[PDB]
Design a protein around this ligand. Structure first.
Ligand code: HEM
Ligand code: HEM
Ligand code: HEM
Ligand code: HEM
Lengths: 146, 141, 141, 146
């Protein structure tokens, strides 16, 4: 993606303060709570019956950490998101059968979580830079769908 | 909100479909799988080859449900109750996908109803499909 | 459908917004204009710069409408009737845009109500803004 | 856009049978009828009071010919849509204030019009090819928005 130097530094600066383990668990848990139909991909994860059940589920936290860790990797290759995510794109299509609209919902939940976590530091311009990044990432992951 | 005029337009157009409803249902699904390949993520268990019995059978079930809704256009929520629960609790199809199938059903009807597909009927059918979609996703959360 | 717990959650969160509702409405608009630039096409007549009084004035109007919606959460269609007419027949904002503002309002709430923005409350607020959006676009066609 | 050679020939072959002025007037009239909020840009056009009034309005028909003629010329540049539509993208954003969602609505209405005009000749694969083209044109027109 196309980020001005100011958008790149905003993104990078905030991400240095993110505990991926923690944010990953929160983001994935909130996705499953707010858009419960997304639970269709996690039948084997245990109890997802209540928000409390979802949020303290260890398989949720574990997966959340995997997903954001992979997401962090793309932050390092902002100029070549498609090439960075090609293998994972094919995996999610061919093996996992995940509708790419789910990538878009996660992108939005992530933004909400950064705002919740960082408060006032997550300014309108910072959000705008993150919105371009999450859209980029979602697009990179849906790229190899067929 | 479907106006009375909308309901009249739908009933007339659907009536013309008549006996071809299941064949049209199948064609709309094939049009969706080809135009919007991401919708295939919900059918990994199906033989999606052209004319497969699975698609033909599913096409028929979709058509019958639409017939049911046209029949009970004044009380869709009750009419599609069961289908609404199934989609919300088991299938869990992202709501976006309903718009893609609706578009492909409109194209199918257009391709088969040269005389009946006027601007006003097109508007009425679009609204009707949007209403059905809204009822089917109403129990999601 | 807003369950009794949804209604409770919404009234509690909005309760805490309190006096800042106008400030948060302006902030949400600002977030929207920066994050989704296409939304600026509806305000060619505004100064969209940071701190613009026009955005602040509009933010207050939006937030007040939301306050009125929370107050009448059981009778939203009637409470928002004049606003539904306005948007449908004059402003004619494409329905897609309502999802973008709703998201920015959620981000604004998150950034200001750390304690109150729990996963359960986040879910109730998303449902509530979707219901407000449905009401506002109900008379479009 | 990335169309296979097969897809390109399918698009070109049907297009050769199109009466541009006629389909243009039809597609624009149907947009204004099916999604009435789109009438917001056309108050100077006169009577848009009923479907009949819209479909018969000479200003609507004239604007439809202009829009589809541009579309038509773009079909010659399938490989460079962004370049072909750059100036128009700017115009639509900066002067006309047209929300790009309108381009997507018109693209779906155009596909329905072709389907209505061609019947059985508008097969599932020909539709798929046209879907890629209308999405490509919408994207090219939304490209310079800021
Ligand atoms: C930022 C977007 C995402 C990234 C970078 C991402 C990345 C990953 C990675 C790295 C894996 C592990 C593959 C392995 O080692 O087996 C994975 C698996 C998986 N992902 Fe994605 N993911 C994303 C979004 C999503 C979303 C939104 C969903 C569905 C709601 C999803 C569903 C899954 C599932 C079901 C698995 C397999 C878990 C298991 O093995 O049971 N992912 N993803
Ligand atoms: C107009 C909108 C729709 C209608 C009326 C409709 C109706 C139906 C009906 C009648 C069934 C069969 C229920 C049964 O056998 O008990 C069904 C199942 C199903 N539908 Fe929906 N549907 C619609 C939209 C969608 C969309 C957009 C998708 C995904 C893109 C979808 C995916 C499914 C799936 C995967 C099944 C189960 C198929 C099987 O395993 O047999 N539906 N639907
Ligand atoms: C929760 C959603 C929304 C609410 C509660 C809302 C509420 C309002 C209110 C209270 C007004 C002022 C009416 C008056 O002048 O009496 C208004 C006007 C307006 N709204 Fe909406 N609105 C919403 C969403 C949107 C969106 C998403 C857009 C476009 C991106 C939009 C564009 C406008 C415009 C252009 C005006 C006229 C502004 C002016 O010229 O003063 N609205 N809205
Ligand atoms: C395929 C998509 C479209 C193409 C290729 C296109 C092309 C054009 C062209 C070639 C012009 C004339 C520019 C000039 O004056 O030099 C124009 C003007 C205009 N277009 Fe677009 N257009 C498209 C879609 C739309 C849509 C969907 C709308 C609104 C619903 C729209 C609204 C307008 C308006 C209001 C003008 C100015 C008309 C005038 O001043 O008479 N266009 N467009």
């Amino acid at each position: 993606v196309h980020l001005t130097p100011e958008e790149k530094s905003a993104v990078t600066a905030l991400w240095g303060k993110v505990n991926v383990d923690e944010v990953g668990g929160e983001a994935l848990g909130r996705l499953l709570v707010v858009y419960p139909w997304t639970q269709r991909f996690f039948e084997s994860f245990g109890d997802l019956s209540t928000p409390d059940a979802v949020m303290g589920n260890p398989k949720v936290k574990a997966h959340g950490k995997k997903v954001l860790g992979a997401f962090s990797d793309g932050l390092a290759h902002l100029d070549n998101l498609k090439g960075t995510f090609a293998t994972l794109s094919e995996l999610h299509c061919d093996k996992l059968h995940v509708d790419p609209e789910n990538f878009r919902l996660l992108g939005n939940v992530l933004v909400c979580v950064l705002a919740h976590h960082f408060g006032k530091e997550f300014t309108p311009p910072v959000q705008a830079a993150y919105q371009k990044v999450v859209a980029g990432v979602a697009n990179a992951l849906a790229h190899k769908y067929h | 909100v479907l106006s009375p005029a909308d309901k009249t337009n739908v009933k007339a157009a659907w009536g013309k479909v008549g006996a071809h409803a299941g064949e049209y249902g199948a064609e709309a699904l094939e049009r969706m799988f080809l135009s919007f390949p991401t919708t295939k993520t919900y059918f990994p268990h199906f033989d999606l080859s052209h004319g497969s019995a699975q698609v033909k059978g599913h096409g028929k079930k979709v058509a019958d449900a639409l017939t049911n809704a046209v029949a009970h256009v004044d009380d869709m929520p009750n009419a599609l109750s069961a289908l609404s629960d199934l989609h919300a609790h088991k299938l869990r199809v992202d709501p976006v996908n309903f718009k893609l199938l609706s578009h492909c059903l409109l194209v199918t009807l257009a391709a088969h109803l040269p005389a009946e597909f006027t601007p006003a009927v097109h508007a009425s059918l679009d609204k009707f499909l949007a209403s059905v979609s809204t009822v089917l996703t109403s129990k999601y959360r």
